[PDB]
Scaffold this motif. Structure first.
Motif, PDB file in Angstrom:
ATOM      1  N   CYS A 337       0.864  -1.376   0.015  1.00  0.00           N
ATOM      2  CA  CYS A 337      -0.164   0.018  -0.023  1.00  0.00           C
ATOM      3  C   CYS A 337       0.858   1.300  -0.100  1.00  0.00           C
ATOM      4  O   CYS A 337       1.839   1.361   0.749  1.00  0.00           O
ATOM      5  N   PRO A 338       0.694   2.302  -0.818  1.00  0.00           N
ATOM      6  CA  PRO A 338      -0.354   2.359  -1.853  1.00  0.00           C
ATOM      7  C   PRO A 338       0.270   1.452  -3.110  1.00  0.00           C
ATOM      8  O   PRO A 338       1.431   1.132  -2.950  1.00  0.00           O
ATOM      9  N   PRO A 339      -0.423   1.137  -4.084  1.00  0.00           N
ATOM     10  CA  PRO A 339      -1.735   1.392  -4.194  1.00  0.00           C
ATOM     11  C   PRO A 339      -2.950   0.455  -3.908  1.00  0.00           C
ATOM     12  O   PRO A 339      -4.116   0.901  -4.197  1.00  0.00           O
ATOM     13  N   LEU A 340      -2.552  -0.392  -3.256  1.00  0.00           N
ATOM     14  CA  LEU A 340      -3.739  -1.347  -2.674  1.00  0.00           C
ATOM     15  C   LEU A 340      -3.961  -1.152  -1.263  1.00  0.00           C
ATOM     16  O   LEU A 340      -2.878  -0.743  -0.628  1.00  0.00           O
ATOM     17  N   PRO A 341      -5.063  -1.467  -0.581  1.00  0.00           N
ATOM     18  CA  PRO A 341      -5.005  -1.592   0.871  1.00  0.00           C
ATOM     19  C   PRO A 341      -4.270  -2.725   1.122  1.00  0.00           C
ATOM     20  O   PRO A 341      -4.061  -3.673   0.594  1.00  0.00           O
ATOM     21  N   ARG A 342      -3.992  -2.824   2.372  1.00  0.00           N
ATOM     22  CA  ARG A 342      -2.901  -3.587   2.885  1.00  0.00           C
ATOM     23  C   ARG A 342      -3.733  -5.250   2.993  1.00  0.00           C
ATOM     24  O   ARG A 342      -3.037  -6.042   2.943  1.00  0.00           O
ATOM     25  N   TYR A 343      -5.057  -5.133   3.640  1.00  0.00           N
ATOM     26  CA  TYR A 343      -5.671  -6.388   3.935  1.00  0.00           C
ATOM     27  C   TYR A 343      -7.151  -6.373   3.430  1.00  0.00           C
ATOM     28  O   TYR A 343      -7.698  -5.216   3.505  1.00  0.00           O
ATOM     29  N   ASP A 344      -7.888  -7.398   3.050  1.00  0.00           N
ATOM     30  CA  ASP A 344      -9.067  -7.722   3.245  1.00  0.00           C
ATOM     31  C   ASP A 344      -9.566  -7.772   4.643  1.00  0.00           C
ATOM     32  O   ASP A 344      -9.409  -8.874   5.488  1.00  0.00           O
ATOM     33  N   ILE A 345     -10.154  -6.618   5.041  1.00  0.00           N
ATOM     34  CA  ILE A 345     -10.778  -6.753   6.455  1.00  0.00           C
ATOM     35  C   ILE A 345     -11.722  -7.846   6.703  1.00  0.00           C
ATOM     36  O   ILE A 345     -11.571  -8.562   7.719  1.00  0.00           O
ATOM     37  N   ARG A 346     -12.769  -8.038   5.848  1.00  0.00           N
ATOM     38  CA  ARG A 346     -13.732  -9.108   6.252  1.00  0.00           C
ATOM     39  C   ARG A 346     -12.920 -10.642   6.264  1.00  0.00           C
ATOM     40  O   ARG A 346     -13.421 -11.472   6.793  1.00  0.00           O
ATOM     41  N   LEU A 347     -11.849 -10.799   5.275  1.00  0.00           N
ATOM     42  CA  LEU A 347     -11.316 -12.148   5.622  1.00  0.00           C
ATOM     43  C   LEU A 347     -10.700 -12.156   6.833  1.00  0.00           C
ATOM     44  O   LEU A 347     -10.579 -13.227   7.523  1.00  0.00           O
ATOM     45  N   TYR A 348      -9.921 -11.054   7.327  1.00  0.00           N
ATOM     46  CA  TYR A 348      -9.256 -11.455   8.661  1.00  0.00           C
ATOM     47  C   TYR A 348     -10.374 -11.497   9.760  1.00  0.00           C
ATOM     48  O   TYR A 348      -9.979 -12.009  10.816  1.00  0.00           O
ATOM     49  N   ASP A 349     -11.548 -10.834   9.628  1.00  0.00           N
ATOM     50  CA  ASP A 349     -12.516 -10.865  10.620  1.00  0.00           C
ATOM     51  C   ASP A 349     -13.119 -12.329  10.567  1.00  0.00           C
ATOM     52  O   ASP A 349     -13.353 -12.721  11.564  1.00  0.00           O
ATOM     53  N   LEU A 351     -11.443 -15.143   9.946  1.00  0.00           N
ATOM     54  CA  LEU A 351     -10.141 -15.682  10.718  1.00  0.00           C
ATOM     55  C   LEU A 351     -10.308 -15.601  12.309  1.00  0.00           C
ATOM     56  O   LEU A 351     -10.240 -16.395  12.963  1.00  0.00           O
ATOM     57  N   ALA A 352     -10.453 -14.142  12.461  1.00  0.00           N
ATOM     58  CA  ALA A 352     -10.628 -13.967  13.945  1.00  0.00           C
ATOM     59  C   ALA A 352     -11.734 -14.641  14.396  1.00  0.00           C
ATOM     60  O   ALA A 352     -11.605 -15.242  15.599  1.00  0.00           O
ATOM     61  N   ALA A 353     -12.946 -14.740  13.754  1.00  0.00           N
ATOM     62  CA  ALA A 353     -14.096 -15.177  14.371  1.00  0.00           C
ATOM     63  C   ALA A 353     -13.930 -16.651  14.592  1.00  0.00           C
ATOM     64  O   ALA A 353     -14.322 -17.398  15.613  1.00  0.00           O
ATOM     65  N   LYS A 354     -13.347 -17.371  13.789  1.00  0.00           N
ATOM     66  CA  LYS A 354     -13.022 -18.690  13.813  1.00  0.00           C
ATOM     67  C   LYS A 354     -11.953 -18.934  14.952  1.00  0.00           C
ATOM     68  O   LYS A 354     -12.298 -19.941  15.761  1.00  0.00           O
ATOM     69  N   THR A 385      -2.668  -7.761  12.674  1.00  0.00           N
ATOM     70  CA  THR A 385      -3.848  -7.246  12.152  1.00  0.00           C
ATOM     71  C   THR A 385      -4.757  -8.639  12.825  1.00  0.00           C
ATOM     72  O   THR A 385      -6.078  -8.067  13.243  1.00  0.00           O
ATOM     73  N   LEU A 386      -4.557  -9.849  12.878  1.00  0.00           N
ATOM     74  CA  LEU A 386      -5.161 -10.548  13.512  1.00  0.00           C
ATOM     75  C   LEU A 386      -5.669 -10.419  14.844  1.00  0.00           C
ATOM     76  O   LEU A 386      -6.674 -10.488  15.136  1.00  0.00           O
ATOM     77  N   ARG A 387      -4.637  -9.850  15.501  1.00  0.00           N
ATOM     78  CA  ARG A 387      -4.825  -9.534  16.996  1.00  0.00           C
ATOM     79  C   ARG A 387      -5.855  -8.403  17.011  1.00  0.00           C
ATOM     80  O   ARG A 387      -6.773  -8.381  17.932  1.00  0.00           O
TER      81      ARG A 387
END
Length: 496
Positions: A337-349, A351-354, A385-387
């Motif tokens: 980043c740039p030009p992309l965001p660093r991570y897919d938030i819903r993906l990490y969310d 993984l966190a939920a699991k 990010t996971l934390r």
């Protein structure tokens, strides 16, 4: 019910992209993982396949990959359909395409052949040069081939162009995965890239042919625009937007009992929305994914993007379907980043939920000493990010760290006891692999890091195959990669 993971993924995809079902994603039955009788797991076209040896002397994976490419093309009776990321195939990859086409012509067949590459966007001679080098190498065999070659760019500003890597023959067999056809990175090197494709046959190969028709319909429609397409064909032949639909049966023959979901994405610049979709998910709580304020984030802040890129949602749903354990093998989880965001938030969310629910997560990425084949400086960019996402659902940072260290394996890849290859270069990996519950897995081209591309892959629900995947790839990978772990619940390692 025999297929709880695909059932859940399929329900999600029908909500996200109903108008693309059949073409950019599709559930089928009656497929087969196309392994040999002697070594049935060798549908799993990993490369280099030299586990335990820092010199990589016996590359059983590379040898099987090239042989299976040649075999499948040489069996063609009607069509050969190839997509990849530029550069166009070279070295022994090219040799396998040429040998296979020679074999099909020698058996008396007349073929239609499409070869599509994505490239960054000036008189561009690369497609016609490739067309003419291939034809010269084919010699007399070229005489009954109808050939289309093209390089395409769908959005310069979103860095969007084809990254799918597909080889479909007669609509019946399909090879797909992460492997680019680049001899220097994969073949003629003592530090080969580690990566994986799968081989299947059955109705799911037709799903891939329909995906390629979707890309070639756009490509042919834009073939007069240099900013978008550079096209070259044999003789007087025209562009073939629908070779699969026109030449192969709409319903590909059955070859086995394997259930599959094919899923891809249209990136940016082909289609802006699925107008049939009414799905409107919640936005995730705020994150630090977007390093810069003026970036337009298609991954995390563009509803319509998801509706024409069902693959992002498919992978997140595959994670959400796990009841016991998830293994992820990637080049990266985060983008530059740039030009992309660093991570897919819903993906990490997801993984966190699991992990908050006690489901184990393993993530193996490419060594940062490669950053080409890495986009992070440290594994802490993933664990932090996971934390932080865990903290939102476990009540705070202390509980988040506990949840993470009790349920996470996080490491960089190795394939032998050595921290690097014997030649001193770090190991690079490039898989796009997700497996859950020793049951259901994705192999394809779609990276889990933010990326706005045309990609494609298969989600396969078969405990038999998933167990083969464990024995042949995930178990050896962990045997050697665990040494680098910063977090490893199984060993009480919590360095992070």
């Amino acid at each position: 019910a025999a297929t709880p993971h695909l059932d859940a993924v399929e329900q999600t995809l029908r909500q996200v992209s109903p108008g693309l079902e059949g073409d950019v994603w599709e559930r089928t039955s009656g497929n087969k993982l196309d392994g040999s009788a002697a070594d049935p797991s060798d549908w799993l076209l990993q490369t280099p396949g030299c586990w335990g040896d820092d010199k990589c002397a016996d590359r059983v994976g590379t040898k099987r990959l090239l042989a299976k490419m040649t075999e499948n093309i040489g069996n063609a009776t009607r069509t050969v359909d190839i997509s990849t990321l530029a550069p166009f195939p070279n070295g022994a990859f090219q040799d396998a395409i040429v040998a296979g086409l020679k074999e099909s012509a020698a058996k008396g067949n007349s073929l239609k052949v499409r070869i599509l590459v994505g490239a960054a966007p000036h008189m561009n001679g690369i497609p016609s040069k490739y067309r003419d080098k291939l034809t010269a190498k084919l010699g007399k065999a070229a005489e009954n081939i109808t050939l289309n070659v093209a390089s395409m760019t769908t959005s310069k500003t979103a860095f969007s162009w084809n990254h799918s890597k597909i080889l479909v023959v007669d609509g019946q067999s399909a090879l797909t995965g992460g492997i680019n056809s680049w001899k220097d990175d994969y073949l003629d090197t003592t530090h080969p890239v580690s990566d994986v494709d799968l081989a299947l046959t059955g109705p799911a190969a037709g799903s891939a042919g329909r995906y390629l028709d979707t890309l070639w319909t756009w490509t042919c429609k834009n073939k007069s625009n240099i900013a978008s397409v550079w096209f070259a064909a044999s003789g007087n032949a025209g562009c073939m937007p629908t070779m699969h639909k026109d030449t192969n049966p709409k319903a590909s023959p059955a070859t086995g009992n394997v259930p599959v979901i094919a899923v891809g994405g249209l990136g940016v610049g082909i289609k802006d929305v699925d107008p049939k979709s009414t799905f409107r998910p919640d936005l995730p709580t705020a994150s630090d994914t977007k390093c810069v304020v003026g970036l337009h984030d298609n991954t995390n802040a563009d509803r319509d993007y998801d509706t024409v890129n069902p693959e992002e949602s498919a992978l997140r749903a595959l994670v959400a379907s796990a009841k016991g354990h998830i293994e992820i093998s990637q080049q990266d989880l985060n983008a530059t980043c740039p030009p992309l965001p660093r991570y897919d938030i819903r993906l990490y969310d997801a993984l966190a939920a699991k992990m908050a629910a006690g489901v184990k997560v393993r993530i193996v990425v490419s060594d940062p000493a490669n950053r080409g084949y890495s986009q992070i400086k440290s594994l802490s960019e993933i664990s932090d990010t996971l934390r932080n996402r865990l903290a939102n659902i476990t009540g705070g940072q202390q509980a988040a760290k506990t949840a993470m260290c009790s349920n996470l394996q996080l490491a960089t890849f190795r394939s032998s006891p050595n921290g690097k290859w014997a030649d001193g270069h770090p190991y690079a990996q490039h898989h796009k692999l997700v497996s859950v519950d020793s049951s259901t897995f994705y192999i394809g081209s779609k990276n889990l890091y933010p990326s706005w591309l045309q990609d494609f892959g298969y989600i396969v629900e078969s405990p038999e195959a998933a167990k083969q995947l464990d024995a042949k790839l995930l178990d050896p990978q962990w045997k050697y990669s665990q040494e680098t772990a910063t977090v490893d619940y199984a060993r009480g390692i919590c360095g992070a």
